[PDB]
Amino acid sequence: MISHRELWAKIANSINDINEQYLKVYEHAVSSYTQMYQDFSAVLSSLAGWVNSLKKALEELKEKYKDKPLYPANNTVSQEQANKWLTELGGTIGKVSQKNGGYVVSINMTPIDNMLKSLNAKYQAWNAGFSAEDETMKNNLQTLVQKYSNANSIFDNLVKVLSSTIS
Amino acid sequence: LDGDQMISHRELWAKIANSINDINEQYLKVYEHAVSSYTQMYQDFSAVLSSLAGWISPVKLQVNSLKKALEELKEKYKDKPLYPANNTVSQEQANKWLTELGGTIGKVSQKNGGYVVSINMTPIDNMLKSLDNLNAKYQAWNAGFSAEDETMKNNLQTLVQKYSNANSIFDNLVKVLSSTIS
Numbered sequence A: 001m002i003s004h005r006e007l008w009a010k011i012a013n014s015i016n017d018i019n020e021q022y023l024k025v026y027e028h029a030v031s032s033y034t035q036m037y038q039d040f041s042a043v044l045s046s047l048a049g050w051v052n053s054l055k056k057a058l059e060e061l062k063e064k065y066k067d068k069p070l071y072p073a074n075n076t077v078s079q080e081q082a083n084k085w086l087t088e089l090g091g092t093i094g095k096v097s098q099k100n101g102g103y104v105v106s107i108n109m110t111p112i113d114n115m116l117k118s119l120n121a122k123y124q125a126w127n128a129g130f131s132a133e134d135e136t137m138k139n140n141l142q143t144l145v146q147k148y149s150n151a152n153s154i155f156d157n158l159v160k161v162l163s164s165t166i167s
Numbered sequence B: 001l002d003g004d005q006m007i008s009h010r011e012l013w014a015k016i017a018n019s020i021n022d023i024n025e026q027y028l029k030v031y032e033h034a035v036s037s038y039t040q041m042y043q044d045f046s047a048v049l050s051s052l053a054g055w056i057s058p059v060k061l062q063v064n065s066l067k068k069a070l071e072e073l074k075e076k077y078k079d080k081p082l083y084p085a086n087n088t089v090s091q092e093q094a095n096k097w098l099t100e101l102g103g104t105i106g107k108v109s110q111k112n113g114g115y116v117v118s119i120n121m122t123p124i125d126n127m128l129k130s131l132d133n134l135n136a137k138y139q140a141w142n143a144g145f146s147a148e149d150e151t152m153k154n155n156l157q158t159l160v161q162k163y164s165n166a167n168s169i170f171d172n173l174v175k176v177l178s179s180t181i182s
Helices: A005-046 A053-067 A078-087 A109-114 A126-163 B009-052 B063-076 B090-103 B123-130 B138-180
Strands: A094-099 A102-107 B081-083 B106-111 B114-119
Touching: A005 A053, A005 A102, A005 A126, A053 A109, A078 A094, A078 A102, A109 A126, A109 B114, A126 B138, B009 B063, B009 B081, B009 B106, B009 B114, B063 B123, B081 B090, B081 B106, B090 B106, B090 B114, B123 B138
Parallel strands: none
Antiparallel strands: A094 A102, B081 B114, B106 B114
């Protein structure tokens, strides 16, 4: 026989682990990215009443969150570890990059770098490509949010089904 | 009580096994159906969306083959509920599921004295209305016609989601029982 108490302790450890490794991770990714965009969203509001003052804030924000990783946070990680997550997030969301010897998942700056690389037929085309890279972020943010709101629901339901398993 | 009791590995599987059956029977056999139904109902509405593209010409349309086609879907899904697949259930339970589905998807309707979550047809009813209350008046009708169609495509994808999650839950349950032997 087993114990009946070692069991509850068993589920308790898993709950705490599922949260620290999975739940809390997603939250960071969302918060970080959500933060970055919540700032770029400013460069979009400022450039309204406005290629230097813009191209500046672009390289300035590109500096802020340039050292703000989605994973980890305060703590560093592995190579084959920053990849499985890179894929879990969506790949197009972050780009793994070595750090002080370790390896972390850094927010992909493909959009920003591309907008700066370009900083009627010259505007109607630029405001089309630049704004096309804006939605890419607006999207990557939503997908990440939905895929986070999923882990939450999944988690909650499994926890209930597990604690309800006894008794 | 007094205070911990003890089970045994085989007894352990029995527990996990029941949870899985209960969950499956009680949960995802419930979702798998609701999706199968709504998905079917929509595909049938998507079969008309193509036909409609043939009743538009200059721009006049055959509002007869239309509505008399919409009312043909209603009749087909008037006795097809999202839950329960068979028999009826308490009004308190039928409502509990109305929420789990999204609320805007189905409508709990009394049947035989009991209850059952019947797929909401109010959008189809919104089309039949506007379809009988008759490039400026057409832009409007179609505008509100493609709006209701967007209210169905949404209800599905969002229902298809909660289902995918129901699967994961089950999938995770299985891993536990499997990762318990060994």
